[PDB]
Amino acid sequence: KRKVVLAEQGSFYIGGRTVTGPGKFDPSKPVIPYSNEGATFYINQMYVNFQAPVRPRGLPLVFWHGGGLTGHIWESTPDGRPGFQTLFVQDRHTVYTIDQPGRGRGNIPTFNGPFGQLEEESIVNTVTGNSSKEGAWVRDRLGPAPGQFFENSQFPRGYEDNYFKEMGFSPSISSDEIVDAVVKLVTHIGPCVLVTHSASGVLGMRVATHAKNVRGIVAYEPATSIFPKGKVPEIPPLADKKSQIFPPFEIQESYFKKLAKIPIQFVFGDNIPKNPKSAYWFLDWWRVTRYAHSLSLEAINKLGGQASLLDLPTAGLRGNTHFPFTDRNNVQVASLLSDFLGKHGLDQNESLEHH
Amino acid sequence: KRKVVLAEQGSFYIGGRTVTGPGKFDPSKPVIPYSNEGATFYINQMYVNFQAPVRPRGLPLVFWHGGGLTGHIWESTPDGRPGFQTLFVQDRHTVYTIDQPGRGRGNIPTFNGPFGQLEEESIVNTVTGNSSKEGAWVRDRLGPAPGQFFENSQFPRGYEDNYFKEMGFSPSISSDEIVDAVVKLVTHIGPCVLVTHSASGVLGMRVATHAKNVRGIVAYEPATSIFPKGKVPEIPPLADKKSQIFPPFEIQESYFKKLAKIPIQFVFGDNIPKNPKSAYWFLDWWRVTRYAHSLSLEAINKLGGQASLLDLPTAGLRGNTHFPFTDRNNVQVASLLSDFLGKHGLDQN
Numbered sequence: 001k002r003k004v005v006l007a008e009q010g011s012f013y014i015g016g017r018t019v020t021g022p023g024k025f026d027p028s029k030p031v032i033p034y035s036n037e038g039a040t041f042y043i044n045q046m047y048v049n050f051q052a053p054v055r056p057r058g059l060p061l062v063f064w065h066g067g068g069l070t071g072h073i074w075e076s077t078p079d080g081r082p083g084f085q086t087l088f089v090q091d092r093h094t095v096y097t098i099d100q101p102g103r104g105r106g107n108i109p110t111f112n113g114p115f116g117q118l119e120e121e122s123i124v125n126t127v128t129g130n131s132s133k134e135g136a137w138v139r140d141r142l143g144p145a146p147g148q149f150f151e152n153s154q155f156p157r158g159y160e161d162n163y164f165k166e167m168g169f170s171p172s173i174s175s176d177e178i179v180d181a182v183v184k185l186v187t188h189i190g191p192c193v194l195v196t197h198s199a200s201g202v203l204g205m206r207v208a209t210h211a212k213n214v215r216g217i218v219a220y221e222p223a224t225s226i227f228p229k230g231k232v233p234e235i236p237p238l239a240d241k242k243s244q245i246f247p248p249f250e251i252q253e254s255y256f257k258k259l260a261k262i263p264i265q266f267v268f269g270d271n272i273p274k275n276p277k278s279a280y281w282f283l284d285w286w287r288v289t290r291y292a293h294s295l296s297l298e299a300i301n302k303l304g305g306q307a308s309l310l311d312l313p314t315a316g317l318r319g320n321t322h323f324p325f326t327d328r329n330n331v332q333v334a335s336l337l338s339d340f341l342g343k344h345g346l347d348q349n350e351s352l353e354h355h
Numbered sequence: 356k357r358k359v360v361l362a363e364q365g366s367f368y369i370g371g372r373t374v375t376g377p378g379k380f381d382p383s384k385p386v387i388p389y390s391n392e393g394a395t396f397y398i399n400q401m402y403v404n405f406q407a408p409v410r411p412r413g414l415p416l417v418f419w420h421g422g423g424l425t426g427h428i429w430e431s432t433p434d435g436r437p438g439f440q441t442l443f444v445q446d447r448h449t450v451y452t453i454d455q456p457g458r459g460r461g462n463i464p465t466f467n468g469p470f471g472q473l474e475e476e477s478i479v480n481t482v483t484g485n486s487s488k489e490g491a492w493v494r495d496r497l498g499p500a501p502g503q504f505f506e507n508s509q510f511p512r513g514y515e516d517n518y519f520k521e522m523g524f525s526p527s528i529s530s531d532e533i534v535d536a537v538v539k540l541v542t543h544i545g546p547c548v549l550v551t552h553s554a555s556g557v558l559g560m561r562v563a564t565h566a567k568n569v570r571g572i573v574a575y576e577p578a579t580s581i582f583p584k585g586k587v588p589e590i591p592p593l594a595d596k597k598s599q600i601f602p603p604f605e606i607q608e609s610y611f612k613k614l615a616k617i618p619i620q621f622v623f624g625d626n627i628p629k630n631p632k633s634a635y636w637f638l639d640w641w642r643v644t645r646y647a648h649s650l651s652l653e654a655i656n657k658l659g660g661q662a663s664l665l666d667l668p669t670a671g672l673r674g675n676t677h678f679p680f681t682d683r684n685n686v687q688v689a690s691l692l693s694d695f696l697g698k699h700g701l702d703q704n
């Protein structure tokens with residue numbers, strides 16, 4: 001089912017700030033090589049793409065890629081099957097896909113000088129970090145070790161090169177500025193649903209506490225848990241007796257309470273072990289991270305919330321990776337997202353696209 | 356008219372290579388913080404988006420952004436009007452839009468360490484360059500100085516912030532590897548037309564000399580001229596008597612003459628002066644660069660080619676900037692591109 005009919009499509013930039021270099025710009029002096037002198041730089045802006053079907057229904061969906069990724073992951077799978085962008089435009093939702101600040105078509109703040117440095121000011125760090133193919137293989141649970149697949153895997157085997165090519169580094173932009181850009185987007189588009197992934201899990205939770213327009217969250221395998229300030233439960237270290245999960249993000253309880261006002265679903269794939277797994281660091285990391293999220297959701301529900309954890313194996317889907325929405329069964333994964341939208345009345349009424 | 360009917364859409368990665376770190380990867384060791392140890396990295400790959408109409412008519416178009424840009428510039432204008440992607444899908448062409456290696460969704464090659472450095476090897480330079488808003492204002496000929504517009508301007512005034520936000524740095528990926536990625540895309544697509552802009556002007560010319568599937572080129576304000584090796588004409592310096600245009604790219608004549616086998620059109624907007632202008636460096640730069648391109652096109656035609664220069668004011672369009680395809684009259688600019696495709700049979704199956 002590849003055909004798509006759009007009432008309109010396009011893209012735009014939103015958010016960000018400006019920084020300035022020293023002095024004044026003289027149009028008579030050679031402009032190349034580029035100089036910081038007299039410069040204004042736009043930094044930390046976000047790229048947004050939208051596609052609106054004919055006669056939209058329900059709330060628009062905002063798909064927010066995980067760490068080191070772009071909106072590509074919602075457009076197509078590594079082997080070329082339709083991504084959730086196409087599937088949900090066909091499902092009659094207006095679909096927004098973003099490249100957050102520091103990723104893809106979002107801004108990478110660098111100037112004339114060492115990476116990220118504007119004269120004496122470090123806007124982002126010159127030293128970068130970036131996962132290897134091997135680190136991503138085990139992070140994404142293709143298998144327990146690079147080159148190996150779980151026998152039940154839903155990964156599109158044969159398209160490893162395509163898959164890993166979509167991943168890259170992120171400069172050290174503050175999470176505050178990333179959240180700020182998406183808050184501005186959701187304010188502009190109206191009531192909407194956030195669909196997040198991995199690193200954008202905690203960021204989407206934060207956006208919701210700042211923006212009443214977020215009416216629901218579906219988070220695919222969020223990477224960082226969130227708790228009210230001062231009320232982070234003790235969580236055991238990993239099986240290696242040394243490592244820990246990502247330090248949970250703490251927000252003031254007045255903001256945390258807003259998470260109890262909308263439906264929230266965390267979706268996990270397969271092959272996260274139940275038992276401690278000292279031989280496979282990322283498998284063990286996912287075990288304890290999933291547990292931490294269970295405690296986070298419990299805190300939301302004790303405030304009157306509607307927060308749930310969906311393990312795809314319990315719904316009859318086996319072998320999903322950390323990217324269920326590009327796996328071979330992503331149509332069945334999409335159906336469960338449609339079910340969430342229908343359960344909570346988020347697919348109702350004629351809707352108009354605006355930003 | 357914003358409606359579009361797509362038989363299919365999607366995106367993929369193509370091209371690139373791999374580099375490796377030292378040692379072995381042990382899955383029992385902490386994976387975070389990320390390490391180069393035992394690492395394989397995919398670098399210099401290109402992002403490609405495609406949209407195919409129902410019943411495509413004529414060759415697919417490959418829209419290739421200029422320097423510091425992305426495929427966004429073909430999707431929408433800064434004020435939110437349809438870009439050439441929509442306009443030419445409506446015109447029944449399959450449309451490819453790329454983010455070249457180093458830009459947008461293309462790969463930026465960096466690792467665990469100083470930007471661009473893999474252990475002791477510099478894959479790209481740690482020191483970056485990037486235009487300011489001020490430099491882009493005058494490069495793009497919005498006006499002669501930042502904050503000023505030419506009075507005839509087709510720029511979408513009021514949307515300056517949207518416009519400049521689309522621009523950014525490019526790492527020092529070799530032009531050879533950028534050309535390589537697009538050659539591989541042209542192999543994948545089959546016969547096609549390249550529609551280039553500024554920095555990708557010279558790169559698209561190079562691609563055509565390596566890819567016979569390029570059946571035509573339309574280049575919006577190419578930034579670097581190209582000549583047969585040993586046959587670069589002397590070109591005068593700029594009015595400040597010290598600056599020069601970008602050193603022209605030289606290729607073997609036997610590659611260069613492949614450019615004579617396909618139609619090629621260079622498109623220039625407005626407000627490039629005829630007189631030397633010492634007060635306005637980028638205006639003078641565009642004057643001498645347009646002249647160099649005129650000699651480049653002459654070299655192609657001397658070899659039996661079909662190369663031409665279209666000044667938009669001669670076609671009745673006044674006030675265009677360096678981005679005619681996002682200006683307020685971009686529908687009329689698009690009509691001139693359709694005219695080129697029709698003249699050369701590139702809108703026919």
Ligand SMILES: COc1cc(Cl)nc(NC(=O)NS(=O)(=O)c2ccccc2C(=O)O)n1
Nearest residue numbers: 066067068139198199200223246247387388
């Ligand atoms: C890199 O180092 C640190 C340290 C700390 Cl404390 N927190 C983060 N945040 C992330 O979500 N980092 S991630 O972005 O690569 C990621 C990690 C695990 C699992 C998944 C992801 C991810 O791809 O989203 N990264």
Ligand SMILES: COc1cc(Cl)nc(NC(=O)NS(=O)(=O)c2ccccc2C(=O)O)n1
Nearest residue numbers: 032033421422423494553554555578601602
């Ligand atoms: C920066 O310094 C050099 C040196 C040399 Cl030799 N060649 C280039 N190539 C470009 O096209 N550089 S550009 O990318 O910023 C650009 C410049 C002028 C006019 C237009 C553009 C452009 O945005 O495409 N840049």
